[PDB]
From a paper:
NALCN channel mediates sodium leak currents and is important for maintaining proper resting membrane potential. The functional NALCN channel is a hetero-tetrameric channelosome that is composed of NALCN, FAM155, UNC79, and UNC80 proteins, with a total molecular weight of 920 kDa1. NALCN protein is the pore-forming subunit of the complex and shares sequence and structural homology with eukaryotic voltage-gated sodium channels (NaV) and calcium channels (CaV). UNC79 and UNC80 facilitate robust currents of NALCN in a heterologous expression system, such as HEK293T cells or Xenopus oocyte.
Further extensive signal subtraction and focused refinements resolved five overlapping structural fragments at 2.9–3.7 Å resolution. Our final model encompasses 1346 out of 1738 residues of NALCN, 173 out of 467 residues of FAM155A, 1528 out of 2654 residues of UNC79, and 1711 out of 3326 residues of UNC80. The NALCN-FAM155A subcomplex sits above the central joint of the UNC79-UNC80 heterodimer to form an asymmetric quaternary complex occupying 200 Å × 315 Å × 145 Å 3D space. UNC79 and UNC80 interact in a head-to-tail fashion to form a plier-shape complex, akin to the infinity symbol “∞”. UNC79 and UNC80 interact through three regions: head, joint, and tail. We observed one C3H-type zinc finger between α26 and α27 of 80-UHD-M, and another C3H-type zinc finger between α46 and α47 of 79-UHD-M. NALCN interacts with UNC79-UNC80 heterodimer through three cytosolic UNC-interacting motifs (UNIM-A, B, C), which all are on loop regions of NALCN. UNIM-A has a short β hairpin structure which is inserted into a hydrophobic crevice formed between α48-α50 of UNC79. UNIM-B interacts with 80-UHD-M and 80-UCD2. Therefore, our structural observation and modeling study suggest that the binding of UNIM-C of NALCN DII-III linker to the UNC79-UNC80 heterodimer in the quaternary complex would prevent the binding of its neighboring CIH in the CIH-binding pocket of NALCN CTD, likely through spacial constrain, and UMIM-C-5A mutations would disrupt the binding of UNIM-C to UNC79-UNC80 and would release the constrain of UNIM-C on CIH to allow it to re-bind to NALCN CTD.
Residue numbers in the entry:
A (entry chain C): 388 to 616
B (entry chain C): 1305 to 1449
C (entry chain C): 843 to 858, 873 to 1159
D (entry chain D): 188 to 200, 226 to 262, 267 to 389
E (entry chain C): 105 to 336
Write the structure that this text describes.
């Protein structure tokens, strides 16, 4: 309970570092010191847990691994060089530990995610499809003049992700059509229409189906429950 | 119109098309009451918006087309919100405050302003209730049928 | 003390085979239910004319409609209370959320009718009273068995919906804290694109006014795009800023709707750095492809 | 207080009775009292009673007035093309927006303290008046997206708009 | 699964990419040539990364039957969506024209269109005195096609012919860029036509037909569950 309270206090203090002006240090201020103190506290907690349960015993919990990863990330983030950088992503993740307050919430999370392998496979397939389509489009529209959405790989990935999100994908398609000209316009238009159709009517549908399947009770469990009636 | 009617009729001569059209119409019949409930909620929020943002100064999306000057216009705007419109810009326009608008100390129909927290709560609640809850019920009915 | 209560009890329960379905639909609800539904629908139609210019407090027709609705609802509720009781009877008027909602609506309507203010200030008590009065069409959710069934089915999955909401709020809080820590005051720049350093963001400059996004009239031999002179200001985008946790949460909630998030992404990239686009992309993928998917899944599973 | 529109710079060089052609709320007394054009930065109401310097200062002021008039013509041309000028607000009229914009522009091109003003208002506050009067005009977002910023804005992030030593010019609405 | 040909083609693509990059080093081609499209199949080698993870407990026959049923369902739903798109495109063609008339300053000459000539912001209208929006004094409704405007700047937006109407209907079905289309239709045509057309299109295409695909995917997952459960 004390650890949970410390997590809550630390994250509340960290999120309360609102902007006040351009005449503030933001390098040795009170918030940085508080982050240092909470990182020290959590490092002491992790070391104590490792001592009590053993290094192998602590790492074998199969769930304290995320806690140790957060410990390492916060320890790295404590340095001024890495302060308020991408490594801060680790620090703000500590609120995940707060999920331990309610066993019902943890059970709901496990059930709504169900078999982690299936959801992980879906996510990996989605990321692979995004990467493949982004690379194909990048090689397709790298050389097109007066075009910015497909110059470099990051911009191509951003464009494909935008098309996946359906927000402004028509604008992307129109820009591509204007860039290619008229001879290649129908072909690239068909390509983009096919990609948008596949994305919207496949990826999101697979996400919904996987979520429902995780929520749907297992067939063996359903048969067992029917048997008890 | 006659040609359109015949083209609609041609759906009944294909087994797959007939089955899918029957699915659509029966799903509509089953979801009639859900649609009625959505319309009731939309009407309540339309009255609320007419009371609140009936005289808001035109903004990025608030114009002669999308505004809460009349109940019908409010209903149309609310319908368009949950069907692919930049509702956030609409809410921010409804979140206009002085010195951008000339406040009135007597009546709410001569202030040209909007309720900041009121607009935030109204739009967030409406979007959460409609675009995130009952449309999923429509999806479930579609899947069942 | 007891006489003529039975009169109301008998009255409030009156109801009523080639077209069997037609007979059942006719006898679906009580006569008092039909009267209340018709009165509520007429009141809704009357409110559909309650424009800010055509105020209800001044238009005689809307006043008469409100009088009729209030009188009839008062009579119906009084008769039901006299007949079936209020609390002691398990099936009295106050039995669930529906009875409480009806009592609240009746009290709001009676207060509005008795007061009838002449000047309603913005963000004032009278405006809130009118807004609460606007909740009148909710009675149809209680006066129809199908609507009550739908509401019950929807509220069945309330716990799961709340848990998904907690997960989404946790994600929003994490990303909002990240955005506040990394972008506090760094999203504001000079409205003049040419001016870069904040020390030079002063005076006035000519700005091009947007005309049409769907037109590409490129013929500009010696003309300049329409625009006019405005002062230079070092200001936030006014639609999303990370100056505080509340603003960050609101911006993330707007992004979750997938409406205009491209503008936020472009602003972040242009005003912070291309590295931070990973942040918004991760947030969109974890909330829009999952959280909304989680809501859809839990609602469908509950159904 | 009779009208005196400045036409000939070489006509003259009492002193508070020279209304400008466009910004008719300013006189030579109002201009030489504090304002200093960079080209001839010696006109501070002292050399007036002695320029050639006075003539050049008057001509530079008239050129400033001409440029302000041209920019106001551009602004009113932009506003005239706005179709929703009759419905953007109830408490605001396009004529009021034009008047307040003209006052703000004259303040921008002449940042001094206007005397003989029955109503005293901070001169920079006129900017807010425009924000409170002129309709929201959506700026172009092709070079860079402005988010939701209006075309005309006055205050910035964590910036104190009102400050000390405000010119506090005349008030007219 | 006949991976020899796939690996050989991947090696061929690698050869092509290598020789293309050698020519790039030779600076003969400035890299702006379309020859970079030769690298299109190279990212497909990522499939080779996941070849092992494409086998499950389900035998080949069960997976083939599941995929055949899913593909047949997807084909039927695609035919249904195409039918709906054709219906709405025909309705748009016969209920709307070309969104070209705009309110412009009355002193405008053909072949002299300027951004300053348009209203701020630019809107649509109708030459009819009682249909759609009417321009205020000083502005008149003009075709803006005899004025020399081209199709490229107008783009594919509108209901010019069957193809353009179908494309616009499909774009609106994704709930993208249709509200502005609705405003243009209201300005250029009677209000009731636009309201009925767009409301029906959103209710049917954007909600029902789109969720039919989700229903098909759910049925596919149900079939997967059945085949997984009945294997033993
Ligand atoms: C307005 O458009 C012109 C033409 O492209 C451009 O040169 C100018 O920079 C634009 N205005 C601003 C403030 O960027
Ligand atoms: C086109 O407009 C310009 C700008 O006013 C004008 O100078 C020119 O004479 C016009 N030409 C025609 C043919 O209308
Ligand atoms: C355009 O309309 C304005 C508005 O009154 C009018 O003053 C002007 O003479 C008109 N120009 C024409 C008809 O060429």
């Amino acid at each position: 309970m004390f650890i949970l309270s410390m997590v809550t206090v630390d994250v509340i203090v960290a999120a309360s570092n609102y902007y006040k002006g351009e005449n503030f240090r933001r390098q040795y201020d009170e918030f940085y010191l508080a982050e240092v103190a909470f990182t020290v506290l959590f490092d002491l907690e992790a070391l104590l847990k490792i001592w009590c349960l053993g290094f192998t015993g602590y790492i074998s919990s199969s769930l304290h691994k995320f806690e140790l990863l957060l410990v390492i990330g916060t320890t790295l983030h404590v340095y001024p060089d890495l302060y308020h950088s991408q490594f801060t992503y680790f620090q703000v993740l500590r609120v995940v530990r707060l999920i331990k307050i309610s066993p019902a919430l943890e059970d709901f999370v496990y059930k709504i995610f169900g078999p982690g392998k299936k959801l992980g496979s879906l996510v990996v397939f989605t990321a692979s499809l995004l990467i493949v389509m982004s690379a194909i489009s990048l090689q397709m529209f790298c050389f097109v003049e007066e075009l910015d959405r497909f110059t470099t790989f990051p911009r191509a990935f951003m464009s494909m992700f935008q098309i996946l999100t359906q927000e402004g994908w028509v604008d992307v398609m129109d820009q591509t059509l204007n860039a290619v000209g008229h001879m290649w316009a129908p072909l690239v238009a068909i390509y983009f229409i096919l990609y948008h159709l596949f994305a919207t009517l496949i990826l999101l549908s697979l996400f919904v189906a996987v979520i429902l399947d995780n929520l749907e009770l297992d067939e063996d469990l359903k048969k067992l429950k029917q048997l008890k009636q | 119109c006659v040609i359109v009617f015949r083209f609609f009729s041609i759906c009944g001569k294909h087994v797959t098309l007939k089955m899918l059209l029957l699915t659509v119409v029966v799903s509509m019949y089953k979801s009639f009451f859900i649609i009625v409930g959505m319309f009731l909620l939309l009407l309540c929020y339309a009255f609320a918006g007419v009371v609140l943002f009936g005289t808001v100064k035109y903004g990025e999306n608030i114009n002669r087309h999308a505004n809460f000057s009349s109940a019908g216009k409010a209903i149309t705007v609310l319908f368009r919100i949950v069907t692919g419109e930049d509702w956030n810009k609409i809410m921010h326009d409804c979140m206009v405050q002085p010195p951008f608008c000339t406040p009135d100390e007597f009546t709410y129909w001569a202030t040209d302003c909007g309720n900041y927290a009121g607009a935030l709560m109204y739009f967030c609640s409406f979007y959460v209730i409609i675009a995130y809850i009952m449309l999923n019920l429509l999806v479930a009915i579609i899947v069942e049928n | 003390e007891h006489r003529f209560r039975n009169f109301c009890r008998v009255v409030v329960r009156a109801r009523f085979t080639k077209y069997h379905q037609l007979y059942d639909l006719l006898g679906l609800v009580t006569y008092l239910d039909w009267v209340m539904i018709t009165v509520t629908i007429c009141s809704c139609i009357s409110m559909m004319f309650e424009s800010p210019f055509r105020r209800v407090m001044h238009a005689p027709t809307l006043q008469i409609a409100e009088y009729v609705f209030v009188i009839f609802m008062s009579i119906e509720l009084n008769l039901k209370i006299m007949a079936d009781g209020l609390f002691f009877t398990p099936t009295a008027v106050i039995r669930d959320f529906g009875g409480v909602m009806d009592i609240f609506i009746y009290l709001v309507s009676l207060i509005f009718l008795c007061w009838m203010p002449q000047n309603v200030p913005a963000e004032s008590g009278a405006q809130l009273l009118m807004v609460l009065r606007c909740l009148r069409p909710l009675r149809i959710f209680k006066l129809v068995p199908q609507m009550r069934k739908v509401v019950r089915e929807l509220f069945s999955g309330f716990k799961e919906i709340f848990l998904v909401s907690i997960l989404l709020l946790t994600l929003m809080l994490v990303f909002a804290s990240f955005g506040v820590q990394l972008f506090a005051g760094k999203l504001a720049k000079c409205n003049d694109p040419n001016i870069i350093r904040r020390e030079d963001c002063n005076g006035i400059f000519r700005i091009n006014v947007s005309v049409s996004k769907n037109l590409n009239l490129k013929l500009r031999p010696g003309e300049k795009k329409p625009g006019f002179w405005v002062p230079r200001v070092w200001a936030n985008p006014r639609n999303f800023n990370f100056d505080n946790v509340g603003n960050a949460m609101l911006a993330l909630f707007e992004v979750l709707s997938l409406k205009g998030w491209v503008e936020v992404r472009d602003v972040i990239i242009h005003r912070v750095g291309p590295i931070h686009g990973i942040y918004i992309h991760v947030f969109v993928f974890l909330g829009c492809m999952i959280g909304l998917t989680l809501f859809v899944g839990v609602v469908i599973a509950n159904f | 207080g009779q009208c005196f529109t400045v036409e000939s710079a070489d006509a003259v060089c009492n002193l508070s009775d020279f209304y400008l052609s466009f910004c008719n709320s300013y006189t030579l007394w109002e201009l030489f009292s504090g304002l200093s054009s960079p080209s001839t930065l010696n006109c501070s109401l002292d050399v007036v009673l002695t320029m050639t310097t006075c003539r050049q200062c008057i001509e530079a002021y008239q050129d400033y007035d001409h440029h302000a008039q041209e920019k106001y013509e551009e602004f009113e041309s932009v506003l005239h093309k706005y179709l929703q000028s009759d419905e953007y607000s109830v408490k605001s009229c396009p004529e009021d927006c034009k008047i307040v914009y003209k006052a703000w522009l004259c303040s921008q091109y002449f940042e001094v303290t206007q005397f003989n003003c029955r109503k005293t208002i901070p001169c920079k506050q006129y900017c807010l008046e425009v924000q409170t009067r002129c309709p929201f005009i959506l700026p172009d977002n092709d070079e860079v997206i402005y988010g939701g910023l209006s075309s005309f804005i006055c205050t910035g992030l964590y910036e104190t708009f009102l400050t000390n030593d405000e010119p506090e010019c005349c008030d007219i609405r | 699964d006949r991976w020899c040909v796939f690996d050989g083609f991947m090696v061929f693509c690698l050869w092509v990419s290598l020789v293309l990059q050698v020519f790039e080093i030779a600076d003969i081609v400035d890299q702006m040539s379309p020859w970079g499209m030769l690298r299109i199949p190279r990212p497909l080698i990522m499939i080779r990364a996941f070849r092992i993870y494409f086998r499950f407990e389900l035998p080949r026959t069960r997976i083939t039957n599941i995929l055949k049923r899913s593909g047949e369902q997807i084909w039927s739903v695609s035919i249904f969506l195409l039918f709906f798109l054709l219906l709405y495109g025909i309705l748009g063609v016969q209920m709307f024209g070309t969104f070209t008339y705009h309110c412009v300053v009355n002193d405008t000459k053909p072949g002299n269109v300027t951004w300053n000539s348009l209203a701020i912001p630019d809107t649509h209208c109708s030459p009819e005195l009682e249909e759609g929006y009417q321009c205020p004094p000083g502005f008149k409704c003009m075709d803006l096609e005899d004025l020399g405007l081209s199709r490229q700047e107008l783009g594919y937006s509108g209901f010019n012919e069957i193809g353009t109407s179908i494309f616009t209907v499909y774009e609106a079905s994704s709930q993208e860029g249709w509200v502005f289309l609705m405003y243009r239709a209201i300005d250029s045509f009677p209000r009731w036509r636009s309201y009925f057309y767009f409301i029906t299109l959103i209710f049917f295409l954007a909600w029902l037909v789109k969720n039919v695909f989700i229903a098909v995917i759910i049925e596919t997952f149900a079939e997967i569950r059945v085949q997984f459960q009945q294997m033993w």
